[PDB]
Symmetry: D4
């Protein structure tokens, strides 16, 4: 009686892909991720550890999984490991991860609101470590250039 | 703990309506409706009463509301009254009913499926009956009629 | 509690009806009710009022609705009004009441087990009554010949 | 303030139904009826046209999740000319069935029979049948059902 | 999934009822009420209206219904109306209200020192008021009074 | 307006009940009460007549699942002429009982005693007794109850 | 190995609300609660809406996420105001004026933030709780009446 | 419809921290803990093992995790290991443990109450026994020892 949207998103994912292709679809969904991050937001956090907690609490709110943030000192990169991306049928690459670019946008926006970053513009989905590690299907690894920010 | 898609659909609906406009959004949503209708289907119903029960059972599966069907034998039609369309933010005409053309596509398939397949039926929404009858916001009134007549 | 059987029962009701017809089906269903009645049962109750309470606790355990019992001052009968019979699609007479004969066997077993009945053989459901009151679709009204009155 | 339990439980009803049918008609006929019911279920809830086995697997599992009937894995065996179907957590309806607890298993043969046909570029007349020796050499859990989809030799 | 004790309590009430009096069972239950009152308690509330809110919060914690408190200055009493006492089969007077004396003890512990009422009080079930008001089976009426009185 | 979802919790009532009863009468009068309550529960919910130990185990798990009282395994030990009953996840009702947390354990004695007898056929006369010392070689969890079904002696 | 039941904060809020009221007055507590409200508003927010009806729908969806009730908005032309009726404020014991409405100032703060974001180039609004019209006639204990009026927000 | 307070508490944790700083917030929170313990309480417990069971029952009632109590010297010392303290954003030392002082105060009242009243005990959080043993973030290690208690 509380609405379920799985089936709707399953059919919507198929129709969109069919109509506009992978490239446009990915852009639409990043843009949706960015929009989502302007309706729900972390406070201004001091540490990456504190940000991890603020974000996991936002994810729990909508049941979209969990995330670990690792601050790599080279490229001053941020590794984002997202667990339990919701599944909406077989669409996406790999199959099941159709909603993965939404995360690119959402994290783009959420982290950029921390001021250690350069904007919500580019968050890179790693394909290599998402297929060389034998990472679970709904686990999404991403990378982000950051500034020299700490802890 | 089950994923909540309300926020994603709120933001997706704003995004789509900015890029493509009402009429293209409506045509995509109906097609999604048609696709849902090839995924979940009622059995061959002998009467409208029996069909109405079968349709409510399918609506129960995904929590998308309740339906009453009424044969308007004078008016060559069926009145479809869908209570409780799931609400996905303020988009749609009227506001709150973005998902309505999905119903049009879904009923189109569901009602033209078993015994309905004989006869060239269409299902279209009444956007004057909704403002005319003071129906609740998430109530969608639709009619099933035959296609064409001319000279 | 996790597996759902509604869809199974829906298609089971259609398959059984088509192979054996209404009459054999009613007999299979009554016999199932009597079997259910030998697996869960009330204690021996002195009064109809107390049996009413015991029967509703049993029904609450499986979610099959509520019942009121009425010892008819003297038809030498017991009126059973059962509310919210589980709906199993559109099969049954009237549509939606496929599971109604199970109740006949269930109350035949449950009541007989108390001081005052002649066996689980005959519980007749009232058809004309269900159309005298204008009774909701899932309210099932039944009558049992009874020995003498338990208050 | 009461939840008028809109969780009707059908487990007790199904336990007694299963005992009752097995008493009246026996194993072979119970199994055909159940396969037929499975076919029926497969005309009400359906996957979309999938290009690959792995995509089909995801689509089937979303359908089972929708009704809480377990999880499935599909594996192509070219050497055996078959698709292996391993269904886990078949709902248990009491002790009927062979082995006990697996009364509902034939419903899967009919269901997977409806759901796997014309999927992933498989074109023809196929039968999903259950394999009781396969379940055994595995030491498979009680509610795990193993089936093979093969080209039809005889059964329909 | 979580244990249900309704069946255990239905059988328990019967077994305790058969071995000992109505009255010995009622004193046992009253003592269990006092017991429950040493395990969950309200804060010291300034008014009777604040006590009512606090008592309902404690009732909601365990799901034992709701309470209204009325000061009756003339009659020198606090009327206590408890709605939706859990039903535990058909034991008790009237049937269904077997747990009623548990409230006598419980409200006994919960009310005495609140609202600037400083003395020695007894909470007593006024059964004769439950039929005076055409009160549902699971509604229990109690009066909080000063200790000693006549016929 | 109040909550759409609250069904009554009896845990708190039962912790305080177990306490008062222990206080008024001793352990053994408490245990005999709860045995009798168990026998009474065995008359309200029951298994069909089962062919085998495995089928009976499944049927009893179905009954226990109906009320949320745990799971059970049954083993025929044809050398002690006994049936070992291992009940897991006995509902805990405070700290009463021996060991603490197992107050409800004699309900299981009565309950299983009634179920087993219903399944005795023409030739069986059984009693079920709780074995607390064999809860030491198992070093079982607190809410696990071990019982033995044995032929009744009926001698002196 | 997951924990099953989600934590309940009802009891904790009941004790916290007593202790704060005991330590500081109605007044310090209320400005404390209004600032939490404003802080909540920077974390959950509506998109920019073009009408009041559209804003009403967007707010009810925010409120639905955290289960904090429902709101209706009504623009009043003859007054310079928008009436905000909030139903089912979560009840957190008997603290507050009236008892049970302790969380109400969070709402002033919350709607203050949301409504400022909705205000265009010309608006400069304050939202204030109107107590003596909640109790002018017969609104439920957990129904809060607020008015949004034109004048600068802070103090 | 079950109001969620996580977001209120995240924001309140920041506002309180901002205004008064760590030591004053902590003392407030210990007072809250003691107040929670005058509202929900264990019974008399002859042993630590009986207390542990009763304490876990009270915690399950509110969903605040689990506890193991270990006696080190018969009357001298108790170690209290608390699992799954509710997380409430990134506040607290270490981040995520803002609610920890409440436990100091709750256990202070729980273990101090009944037997344990006769010791003049104080419960205090060990901050580098948590990290020396590399305990989970929401696991709180406290000790009960002798020293002055009241204000």
């Amino acid at each position: 009686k509380k609405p379920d949207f799985t089936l709707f998103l399953q059919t919507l994912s198929w129709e969109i892909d069919d109509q506009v292709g992978i490239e446009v679809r990915n852009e639409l969904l990043r843009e949706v991720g960015r929009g989502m991050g302007t309706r729900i937001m972390p406070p201004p956090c001091q540490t990456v550890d504190k940000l991890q907690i603020e974000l996991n609490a936002l994810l729990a709110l909508i049941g979209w999984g969990t995330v670990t943030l690792e601050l790599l000192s080279e490229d001053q990169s941020l590794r984002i490991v997202h667990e339990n991306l919701p599944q909406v049928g077989s669409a996406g690459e790999p199959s099941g991860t159709w909603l993965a670019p939404v995360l690119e946008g959402l994290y783009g926006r959420w982290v950029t609101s921390q001021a250690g970053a350069f904007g919500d513009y580019v968050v890179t989905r790693d394909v290599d470590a998402e297929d060389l590690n034998a990472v679970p299907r709904q686990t999404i690894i991403m990378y982000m250039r950051v500034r020299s920010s700490a802890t």
